[PDB]
Amino acid sequence: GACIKQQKFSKNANQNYKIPASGGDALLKYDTHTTLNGRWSNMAPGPPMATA
Amino acid sequence: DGVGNASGDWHCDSTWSEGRVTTTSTRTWVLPTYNNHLYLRIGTTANSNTYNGFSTPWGYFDFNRFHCHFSPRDWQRLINNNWGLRPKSMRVKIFNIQVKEVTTSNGETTVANNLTSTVQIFADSTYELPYVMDAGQEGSFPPFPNDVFMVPQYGYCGVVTGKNQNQTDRNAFYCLEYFPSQMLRTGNNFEVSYQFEKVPFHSMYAHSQSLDRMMNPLLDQYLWHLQSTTTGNSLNQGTATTTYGKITTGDFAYYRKNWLPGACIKQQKFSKNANQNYKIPASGGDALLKYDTHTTLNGRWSNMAPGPPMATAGAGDSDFSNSQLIFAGPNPSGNTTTSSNNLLFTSEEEIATTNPRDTDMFGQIADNNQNATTAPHIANLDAMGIVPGMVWQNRDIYYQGPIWAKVPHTDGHFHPSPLMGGFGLKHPPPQIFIKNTPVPANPNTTFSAARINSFLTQYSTGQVAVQIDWEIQKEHSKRWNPEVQFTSNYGTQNSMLWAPDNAGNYHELRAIGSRFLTHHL
Amino acid sequence: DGVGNASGDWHCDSTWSEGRVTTTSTRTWVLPTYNNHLYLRIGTTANSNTYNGFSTPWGYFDFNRFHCHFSPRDWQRLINNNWGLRPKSMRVKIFNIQVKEVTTSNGETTVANNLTSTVQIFADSTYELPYVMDAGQEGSFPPFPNDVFMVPQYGYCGVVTGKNQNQTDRNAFYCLEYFPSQMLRTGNNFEVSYQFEKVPFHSMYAHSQSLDRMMNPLLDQYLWHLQSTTTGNSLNQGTATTTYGKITTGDFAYYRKNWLPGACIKQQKFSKNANQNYKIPASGGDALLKYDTHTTLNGRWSNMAPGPPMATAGAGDSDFSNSQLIFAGPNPSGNTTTSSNNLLFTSEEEIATTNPRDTDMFGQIADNNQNATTAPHIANLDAMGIVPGMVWQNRDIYYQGPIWAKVPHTDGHFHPSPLMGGFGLKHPPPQIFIKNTPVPANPNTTFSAARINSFLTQYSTGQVAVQIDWEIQKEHSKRWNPEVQFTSNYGTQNSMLWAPDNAGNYHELRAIGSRFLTHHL
Amino acid sequence: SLDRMMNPLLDQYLWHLQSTTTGNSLNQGTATTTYGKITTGDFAYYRKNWLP
Amino acid sequence: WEIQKEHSKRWNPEVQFTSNYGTQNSMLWAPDNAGNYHELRAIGSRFLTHHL
Amino acid sequence: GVVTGKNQNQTDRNAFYCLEYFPSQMLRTGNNFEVSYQFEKVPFHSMYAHSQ
Amino acid sequence: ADNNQNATTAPHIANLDAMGIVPGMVWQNRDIYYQGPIWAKVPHTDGHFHPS
Amino acid sequence: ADNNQNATTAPHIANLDAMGIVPGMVWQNRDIYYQGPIWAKVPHTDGHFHPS
Ligand SMILES: Nc1ncnc2c1ncn2[C@H]1C[C@H](O)[C@@H](COP(=O)(O)O)O1
Ligand SMILES: Nc1ncnc2c1ncn2[C@H]1C[C@H](O)[C@@H](COP(=O)(O)O)O1
């Protein structure tokens, strides 16, 4: 089936890059997202895909 | 019946009822002789523009454009009061036929009636000939009932193999004198009926909600998400902590959703201001066909216009793309102009609620799996096809726009809505073909087996009436506040719009969509 | 009915069903005045070419050629899927008639309708007039339905006595104004029906066996023959011994057989390469009429072409004979060419299984009774008539070829299949005759008993439709491997075949037989 | 062909941007928005109802 | 098997599947000297044409 | 088959016939086969010699 | 495959991170959960794909 | 088109090597072959697209 790649995160804090919650570079920026009319929407859960 | 008896009447009317409207249009046509009674194979080998085919002595009627069947006031009644539209049924008459002999003697032309000449007519109800009526082309009736129009010449195209025009063994030739046809003198008349296959209503409304805002603004989700991988406001700094949080009211970008916006193919954007555009020539190695988003069949480049439905700029905005259909007013002369003020721009901006912008993107995607030593990277999604869970909105119909298209005959198609707008039809309204029957000139008195190349010069005139039954859904909505309506806002005018001018010219100075009323997702 | 009412419609169609096909063809015709309203006796005394007869003001319709009734695609459906063909029934209509006055005043010609003028039509269903329609001549409808054709002038021939044209008391004159005829103004129309007499199907197949190989290759005969009169490999040497042997498998020339190949008359062979031919002039004491196989009636020489059915060279071979019919393409100009590439050659090679070659011989025959002192001598059989036990195969029908011929009215005939191909008919489809009725000019106001020599100049036009019901035998065969089919192999073409060209000209660049599928003896 | 489905003899009533500059060369000439009708004979620029 | 018969107003001849193999030592689609039956070609179903 | 000239090589007109392609009755030791046939009307053979 | 390789050109591959639906795909929808939503309302729009 | 050009930005194009289905596409299925499979079983799954 179809796929849209999704960003992967670890439940172990040390294995993640350091991404802040808000700012110019925020986690909304790095998650796969869609754009309606200029706005960013988190693509969650998105199209059906196998996961961990 | 006879020479002194009219075979039809003039009927132009619109009958309105709740759930139904019937339009009828009558026009006067003139049919010349095309190709001097000959079939001619045509083509040129011009890179992407390579074509081949045949032009025929025949001509045909196309009413396929909306303003044929509606007055500007009838179009207003339709779009202000109704959510939906679709044709039920059709019938066409051709009558009051007049064939004319034209003679040149002293250098001036005289015209007389030829009472025994015939015109040939057949409707192709079985679709055995290439269907050209849906191509978005000239030859449709004029929008103004007093105008007289010339019947367009019929022709078709073949398979193009590569960038060379030369035919292969798969190319087909179609002789129209090979179809049974009714022959008509001045007393005779022609008639045909048609039933539209059931098709979804067009949506004459715009959404009053956004696809991503469909939720309740007052409530939290019971879903949870990762808020951040670190403390602080800065990237690659702070302490590494996985911070999970509930998805609270007020942050609506992070809400989980059941639906996605529709498909997108990014389109190149241009400014109506000449100074804000890069300099791209019309032809050359680097041309504008190269820079527009385009598709490739068999090596050839085709402009992707208008393309899949996407939100676009407003009709008054500076920027525009090939996703917008462009109409012209009277002001340009010579099929070229340097000013956008002479042109009628169309806007799909209404669908910005469920459709991605034509010039922007579908979204942005994660390229890689980040880790402690790897920073996250994102790329743009310029073109994204359809995935399960997308919902979109089709292009709007326009008063100057096409009513229907023929769904290609192929063993697959997806969401068969025509991209220039209107009603996709597996069996569209038939093409009605007409030609003047050849009348030989004075022959030689010794037999020759060569074909007759010498002909009396003739043309025919008459009237054609088209009646269509339309089914309409009346708006029923609990919206408290007033809707947007289509109105005359034009103000004080020297010459009022939608009427003839001083010189008797009737022009259309605006492009009118069908989407005014609103409906919630 | 009336001047402003069409008396017919255009019908060109083919309706296919299992066991049956119905073709219909409509054309536009123009009829001039022939011989200035006069009968004229014609003839010249030219050796073998001596003729006499009459030309008439009348003209006639002949559809007798196959491409009149079939499109190239309909011909393909027929010959690929079917073993056999034959016409069941026919009907003809003539309608939408227009008579034209033509006037010359200042040196330019003007044309007007003459509404009260008539045209005369009768079909000769009783065959009382000489039947010229089967002669393989021009005047048949064009193969392409958009072409307009001139109606051919009617004329006939008498008895030629010797090489002088002078008539004797046996010569007959035929006045066609002596037959009842229907007179038609512009509102009137004509119609006639015809039933074909039962006739054998044409064979649209070629044999997949040879007449001499019909046996079982694995088995011996129980018959015995004389193998040799002497020991050794050399003639007139060795010991004289009568050596008899059984006829073993593997020597199939010596097998006894139930059947013989068909009749033969040897034909002179010519090369398409000019250097490989002996130099034979067109006219003179020694001319090419002298060297071709020919027959003699009453002192006159007639080319035997095509002659009795015989196998011949392939259409692409260098050699050819008069057994092959030749058609032309457009390329020659002036009824003469030096190049065979402009010509369409026909091949009977398919019948090489049961028919002797046209240019070779039937076989060789023993002249004498040999003995110990007499060596055996053989002669060629160039012409051998029919003996009991022969089986043969008729000439093939061609898409450009004649459909039928009239069996001569005589008290004997043998195997009445027309030698140019098609269906021999004792009562063929009737000839339909048409002429413009004379309209006198301004007469003198004093009575004169001289006949009126002064006439308004006129011609007529109209449409003619012909419908034929054909009966077809569908191929049923247990052959495992694929058949040969008629296909478009033409490849990549600048102008595709079987279609009009740039200038609107429709030409036939190939000659298409009916024999593709195979059948075993 | 999917892209040739039209009538070769007729123009569209649609209009498009032909060029952003005068001349045959990229990044050269005078900057002008040149709009034109879509004429018969240039079939790459025809608007279409269907895609491959 | 249910089959739809071709009905088309095409004037000129179609492409057909034919034996074009010519003169062969051992004819195709038949057993050979040793009695072996082989398939030396791949045959599609698409010969006739139809307009979009 | 057809012999073309004095060479045996087949052409495209040669036919192959598989007899396992005809419906056939299969018989074990208890089974039997039967068929009937009617001659078409044909002239008598002349079993006499002429006495004139 | 990004490119057409040849004797002088090495083959190059790229990742497909997002691929939409092509003819012949088959997939499986997300599972329902005891804590999860039972239904959703299909948006009112003139197109939707696989409205799960 | 990758980017939005402007007076200071030249237009850039990229190839579409893989493009999924958008509304308005029409295509044609693979041909059947005399040596080819007649049918396949549609997988048992809760979605499939154009199950040819
Ligand atoms: N214009 C046009 N013609 C034909 N088929 C179309 C068209 N637009 C969409 N569709 C197809 C695809 C939609 O999901 C479906 C709607 O059917 P319904 O249940 O009626 O809403 O019909
Ligand atoms: N073209 C044509 N017209 C008329 N008679 C013909 C023709 N060809 C052959 N014959 C005659 C001579 C044949 O032996 C016989 C076949 O009749 P059957 O029993 O029908 O096969 O009919």
Author numbering:
A (entry chain G): 483 to 534
B (entry chain A), C (entry chain B): 222 to 742
D (entry chain I): 431 to 482
E (entry chain I): 691 to 742
F (entry chain J): 379 to 430
G (entry chain G), H (entry chain I): 587 to 638
Quoted from the paper:
Adeno-associated viruses (AAV) are single-stranded DNA packaging viruses of the Parvoviridae and belong to the genus Dependoparvovirus. The virions of the AAVs are composed of non-enveloped capsids with T = 1 icosahedral symmetry and diameters of ≈260 Å. They are assembled from 60 viral proteins (VPs): VP1 (≈82 kDa), VP2 (≈73 kDa), and VP3 (≈61 kDa) in an approximate 1:1:10 ratio. In this study, the structures of the AAV7, AAV11, AAV12, and AAV13 capsids were determined by cryo-EM in an effort to complete the panel of available structures for the defined AAV serotypes.
For AAV11 and AAV12, the closest related AAV serotype is AAV4 based on VP1 or VP3 amino acid sequence ranging from 78 to 81% aa sequence identity. Most notably is the 5 aa insertion in VR-V for both AAV11 and AAV12, relative to AAV2, but also to AAV7 and AAV13. This density extends into a pocket underneath the 3-fold symmetry axis and has been interpreted as deoxyadenosine monophosphate (dAMP), which is positioned between conserved prolines 421/632 and histidine 631 (AAV7 numbering).
